[PDB]
Design a protein around this nucleic acid. Sequence first.
RNA 1: AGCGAGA
Lengths: 104, 73, 49, 98, 49, 58, 225, 228, 49, 82, 174
Amino acid sequence: CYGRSMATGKLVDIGEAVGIVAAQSIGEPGTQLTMRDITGGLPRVQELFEARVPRGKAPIADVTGRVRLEDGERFYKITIVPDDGGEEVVYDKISKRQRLRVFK
Amino acid sequence: ITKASLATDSWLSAASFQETTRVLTDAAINCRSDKLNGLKENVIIGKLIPAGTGINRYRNIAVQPTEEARAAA
Amino acid sequence: AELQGLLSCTLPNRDGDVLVDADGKAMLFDGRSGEPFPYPVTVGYMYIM
Amino acid sequence: SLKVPHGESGKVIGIRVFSREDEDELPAGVNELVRVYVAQKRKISDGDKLAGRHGNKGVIGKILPVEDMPFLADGTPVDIILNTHGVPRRMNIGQILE
Amino acid sequence: DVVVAEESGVIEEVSADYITVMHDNGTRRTYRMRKFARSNHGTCANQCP
Amino acid sequence: MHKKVQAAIINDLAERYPMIVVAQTVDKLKDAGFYWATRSGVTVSMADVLVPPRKKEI
Amino acid sequence: LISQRPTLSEDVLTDNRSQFVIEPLEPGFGYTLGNSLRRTLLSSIPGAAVTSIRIDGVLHEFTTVPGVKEDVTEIILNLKSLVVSSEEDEPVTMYLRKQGPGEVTAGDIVPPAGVTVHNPGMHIATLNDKGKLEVELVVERGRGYVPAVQNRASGAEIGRIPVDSIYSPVLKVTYKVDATRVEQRTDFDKLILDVETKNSISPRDALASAGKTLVELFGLARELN
Amino acid sequence: LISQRPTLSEDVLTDNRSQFVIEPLEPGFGYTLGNSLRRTLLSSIPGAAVTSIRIDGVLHEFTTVPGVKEDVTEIILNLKSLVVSSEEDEPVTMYLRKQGPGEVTAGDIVPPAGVTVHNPGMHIATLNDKGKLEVELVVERGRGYVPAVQNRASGAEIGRIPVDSIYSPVLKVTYKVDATRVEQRTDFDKLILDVETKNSISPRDALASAGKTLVELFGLARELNVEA
Amino acid sequence: AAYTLQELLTIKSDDTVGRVKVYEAIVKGENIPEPGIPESFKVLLKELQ
Amino acid sequence: GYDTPLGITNPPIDELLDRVSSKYALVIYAAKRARQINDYYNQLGEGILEYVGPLVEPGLQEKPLSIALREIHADLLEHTEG
Amino acid sequence: VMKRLVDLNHAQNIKSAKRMVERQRPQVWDVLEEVIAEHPVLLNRAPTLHRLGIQAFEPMLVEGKAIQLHPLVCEAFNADFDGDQMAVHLPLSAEAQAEARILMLSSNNILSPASGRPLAMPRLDMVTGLYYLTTEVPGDTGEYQPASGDHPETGVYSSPAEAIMAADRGVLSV
RNA sequence: AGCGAGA
Ligand SMILES: [Mg+2]
Ligand SMILES: [Zn+2]
């Protein structure tokens, strides 16, 4: 399931500590991992592995449905009528300055 | 990652990691017993890591010549 | 520009021969093999420590 | 007894014997403080660090005999040979100009 | 780190250890060199006229 | 032999051939590379740094 | 076919510099031969240099003689530029006494029989009214560069001050070739070897010694036959 | 007097291929002697090789000879790498000829007295459909590698086309030095020569000849003041 | 690489009893003994206690 | 082709890995064999004991572990994994 | 080395041997060459950002005070020669020596454990030399020309050896 | 304990 050992070039052994190898391989490109508000650098990596709610939390689609975005500066309201379901949900405080991610 | 690490079943490793005082207090209150199965622990107490050349299939290989080799003697 | 101009006039060392051309590079002989290096090489005086 | 620490050697330039017996201002308790000055003349060799004035540093890989050195058409051997690859991307062509 | 004449004059007698200079008005002054004194970082503090 | 092509060659060599051969080949490659870099005639001089003639107009 | 071995004709430009023309040589061979000679002249020419000195009123090289204007270290540096030639393997000693004001130059040494100083005007030091510089030097035969031996190497006591020594007189060797490289392939190489020595031995002698050294090794190569 | 005596050994790899190893040598004489041996082995040992050739029916067209499979260039190549030894300095001539289909080999050429071929069983050319081939070789002896000499005469020999001449027997000499006994001996150098030569002469004898010519060559330098 | 790690952290660094033993084994040419418990773990035990 | 290795890289490891399942197995295998032969040499002075070896003509000055590796190369040993 | 020079009888006993070594007596260099042979050593360069920060080499004696590193492993250490200081460790136990000789040997670790791209690949100088060697420059000396009617192509050569021998002459460019 | 420095 792990797959091929990248270093040895063949299948892994039955005692390899793939965990340490993994972690060190993630960390090695530090520093040379530079940057150019939602983070995008080493802080962003840290956030991803820290499960921290990102600063630029863009809303995501929850249930398939026609959208009824309303206009609120820093507080865009976003209604979505569920295709099958229950009740459309409006998002009281969403940042206007963002730009809606393209869809189909 | 931090929480996952600090939720391990090994107080000697969590203590080695971070925020020593709290982890020891918790483990003490729980009378927690560490089974010494990870790598950091085996390093700390100085016995062989259970990885690579240390696991129980290679660590105790039996090596001997062949009966033909004994005949060569 | 002044460096180029000065480097053009580099009055000869002891006999009539200018070891460094206008570009600032000279032809260097290989000490080991002996054959001259195929291309001229930047040579000069550096103040190192 | 005071012995030369490991990895040291050279000439004994000066020895100073500041003693309480000589009524020197020794700190309370010592009766005789002696300082020996050892000097060594260090010559250049592999591992020593040289550098110009434009951040072009480096340790000495080797010290070749003068014979197997690139020598100009007139027969003057060069003294040093820096690497070209370090100049452009370190962006310090001042040395070249120098 | 370098000895500078305090007042004008003619060098009367100079040696490796000291320089005695005769000033323009009778008086003479002697600067004593510092020979191979150890510096704070183990380097040499030699002075020579 | 761009560095990319060298990398591809060494990758294929390691995939196919045993590691010891890879080491020997890499070492021979280093030797030849140093020798021919010495002969390559790559040096930096002000004259070799050519400014673009159209700079002022731009 | 060449069917014609080379020959070496000398011409002399000055007392200590000369040129040697070797011709005819096989095509693309002069560079190799000239480089071989040059490297010989630059490594293995048996020389002779001061190997250890001693000043009467000095115990080590990091001090100063009263009256003398130069440190002992400056004096060793000045001596190290001396050029001498000896005739015997055994270490020889030669003295240098000067008192009172004056310039102590290389012409003031009293070389014993055999050894001689070739540059009397070299400035060793200068003195004043109170200075008294008495130094005995040791000259020894050898080759190449050798670091100064230590006081613990031999029985010399304290006063001995070993000095680095450079046993070689070759000042500068260069060569140039002008190959014909005709279209009819009657090619040959003429090698012009310019040799400059420091007046210790004429370039003729240096070239002869280099030829001897080489023919030894190549005669070994022939003896494989 | 030299404190250490150089010693020349040799490891033998094939019938004509060998690793010569001379140790120890005063530092640095590995290069001093090695570059010389390489160049001399390559460009001093006398030999013989085909200098020019002509083919019947080949006058102005150098693309393909009729009646043969191999075109002009390939036969030029094969003649070029035809090992031969000669004794008479002047350019001798040889005549190869074969009629009918088959496989023409070097062993088929008839040599005059004084010139010998050291590889009769070498494939030169192919004939088919009752074809006939005749080839005339102008061959002398020389040294080194002489590029193709353009014919000085214009019409004297129209058929005789020049070919590059590989006079030297030794094929490939490559040298490297190493740095034995850094401490006890103060880093003496040892030379490893690798010599590959054709079957004309064994590598050892080739070196013996090279060493002899270097002896005589530096005898010029030694001659000036022998008592040095 | 596990055995070399244990060797390093136990008998090269800390183990006060094994250390003289490995020195003895090296001097006399015997097999390197088995590593013991590093002496820092016990100071930790005493401090926690 | 792998022209003959010279020092610590002789015998070639990739050849050795055929005799075993994993590199770690080779490490332990060679280390235990080397320990065995080193003890054999140490105890040769006293009366003979169960330890045996070497099975390959050793170099005059050659360390036990390289002897063991030379043995391993020629399939002169057997082992059982835990 | 003490053990070996007591075995070789250069010293009578251990303490005499220790005295022998503490003054670096001339006889104790040859024995040193004997002992170091076939004894792997690890070379670490702090920081060890990844697994290839520590590799085992076979040590060899060099004159002066400076660990002579192999250039091709420079990238693996990210160690570049302007005053980096590389620590050396010496395995002792049979297991440790096997581990160093087998798992850690520099020649056994070519491909990165991260992305598998070769890490002993030539670079900087070597890559430039090879680029110069293997590149093609039209219009160079000794080029191929298929012209006929007056002479053959005069671009072909019997064997590579012939090509090198021509390049030695000022005829064929590389 | 405090300073300064190399990578
Ligand atoms: Mg650095
Ligand atoms: Zn699975």
